[PDB]
Design a protein around this ligand. Structure first.
Ligand SMILES: O=c1ccn([C@H]2C[C@H](O)[C@@H](CO)O2)c(=O)[nH]1
Ligand SMILES: O=c1ccn([C@H]2C[C@H](O)[C@@H](CO)O2)c(=O)[nH]1
Ligand SMILES: O=c1ccn([C@H]2C[C@H](O)[C@@H](CO)O2)c(=O)[nH]1
Ligand SMILES: [Mg+2]
Ligand SMILES: [Mg+2]
Lengths: 167, 170, 149
C-alpha cells in the first residue's frame, strides 16, 4: 500500500458534511476540495475555508500541497496563497482563498470545489550541516550539524491539530 | 526511456509561425522557460491567459507539469502566476495565467521573452484510498468509503481531452 | 549520504551576527523555516526581496529547493510569496520575495519571526526531450526536434 491515502472525515457517519475529495478525471493529479459551509468572500478579502476532511495517512514519501484550481483562479480572480500540509498534521484541511477583485465578491458554494490537493514527493532530510565558505581562500568551516533524531531548533514536539502560525 | 523523457506537442502546423519552444536556460535549471505565442499588454491589476503554443504529449514517469512564476518577471514586473497544475491526461495547449499587481503599469508580453517556467514534479498517483471516521475516544475506525483508481469514484467525466479552466465545474 | 542530506552555506563570517539558521519547527514539518538577516516594514501593496543569510551548498539527490509561503505570515499579515524556484546550480544567497496585499497596513519583518519556508521537492531532471506535431485529423506524428541533456 505505497500509492495509498486515508482521508479522515471530521463529521460522524450519517451527519451532513462537505462533498468528499475527488479526482475529476482518470489522469487528474489532484483531489478537488469542497467547502463544508457557504460564504461570499468580500472584494480584496482573504478567507479560511473548512473542507470537512483531514489526512489520516499520506502516501509514502509525500506531503499534501493545496494549490489553486485554474477555473476558480481565472473566472473568479482568486489565488490560493498558501497550502503546505505537514505529515504530522491531524487537523482539518482549510483552504486559504484570496479575492483580487476590487468590486466583486467570490461565491463559496457546497457543490463547487474551491482548490485541489496534490500529494507531492519531498525529501525528509536526515542529515544537515551549516558551513561557512571563505570566498577568498576556499576554506570551509562547519558551523553546525544535526541528524533528524536530534530534533534541533524545534518549536514543539507534537503538531497535533495546530496550524496557521502555531509555531 | 520514459523515466527521464518528455514529449512536447506543437499546436501550430510546421509551415507556420509560433512561440519559441520550451527550453531549459542552464544545465542546473530545474524548469523549462515558457514563451508566449502572441503579444499583449496586461492592464494594471489585470489577469491574462496566455497561449504558449505547446502541450505535453508525454510526461516523465510519475511526474506532472507545474507552471510556476519566473523570479525576474515576478520582481521586475510586479506579477504572479496564481495557478499552474497540469493534469497528465490534458491534451490541450498550455496557457500561462499571469496577474499584474501594479496599479499604474501595464505588463508587456513579448514573443522573445519567457513569461513562466514549467517543472516536472514527482507526485503520487493514488491507487487505493479510504475515507474513515476516527473516534479517538472509543479507539474505533469506521470506514466510510474505499475505492481503487479504476472505480472512477465521483468523477466528472472519463476523458479530459483539451478541457481545462474549470471544465469540471458547473 | 547524499540521498537525504543538505548543506546550507552561511554567508556571514563565523564571528558575525546573522539571520537565524533554516530550521524544521516539528518532527513532521516538511519545510525549513527561513528568517530575515535584517528588519524592515513592507509598505502597503509593497513587494520586498528579503535576504535570509543562507544559500544551499548541497541539495539532497534529485531535489531542488522551493520557497513557499508560511500559513501564519500569509493569513495574519495578508501576504504571499509569489516566486521561489531555486535551481540546483545556484550558489547565491536565498532571498524571499514577499508581497503585501494590504492597502492600509505595513508588514513587520523581524529577526525572530520566520518569513517563508523551504521544501526540498523531488523533480525530474529530463535527460531526453522531443517536440512533435500531431495532425488532429489524420493522427500522423512529425518529429520537429529532439535533444539529450
Ligand atoms: O492552506 C493551508 C495551510 C496550512 N494548513 C494546516 C496544515 C499545516 O501543517 C498547518 C500549518 O501550516 O496548518 C491548512 O489547513 N491549510
Ligand atoms: O495554469 C494552468 C492551469 C491549467 N491548465 C490546463 C491544464 C490542466 O490539466 C487543465 C485543468 O486545470 O487546464 C493550463 O493550461 N494552465
Ligand atoms: O524567490 C526566489 C527565486 C529565485 N531565487 C534565486 C535562485 C534561482 O536559481 C535564481 C533564479 O530564479 O534566483 C531566489 O533566491 N529567491
Ligand atoms: Mg481540476
Ligand atoms: Mg510551519
Amino acid at each position: 500500500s505505497s500509492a495509498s491515502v486515508v482521508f479522515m472525515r471530521f463529521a460522524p457517519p450519517g451527519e451532513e458534511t462537505a462533498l468528499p475529495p475527488r479526482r475529476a478525471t482518470p489522469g487528474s493529479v489532484a483531489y478537488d476540495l469542497f467547502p463544508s459551509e457557504e460564504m461570499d468572500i468580500e472584494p480584496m478579502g482573504l478567507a479560511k475555508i473548512s473542507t470537512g476532511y483531514g489526512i489520516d495517512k499520506f502516501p509514502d514519501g509525500c506531503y499534501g500541497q493545496i494549490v489553486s484550481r485554474s477555473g476558480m483562479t481565472w473566472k473568479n480572480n482568486t489565488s490560493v496563497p498558501t497550502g503546505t500540509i505537514d505529515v504530522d498534521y491531524r487537523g482539518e484541511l482549510k483552504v486559504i482563498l484570496r479575492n483580487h477583485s476590487a468590486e466583486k465578491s467570490v461565491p463559496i458554494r457546497k457543490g463547487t470545489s474551491i482548490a485541489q490537493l496534490i500529494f507531492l514527493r519531498y525529501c525528509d532530510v536526515e542529515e544537515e550541516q551549516i558551513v561557512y565558505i571563505n570566498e577568498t581562500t576556499g576554506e570551509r568551516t562547519i558551523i553546525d550539524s544535526s541528524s533528524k533524531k536530534d530534533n534541533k531548533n524545534q518549536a514543539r514536539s507534537v503538531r497535533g491539530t495546530g496550524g496557521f502560525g502555531s509555531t
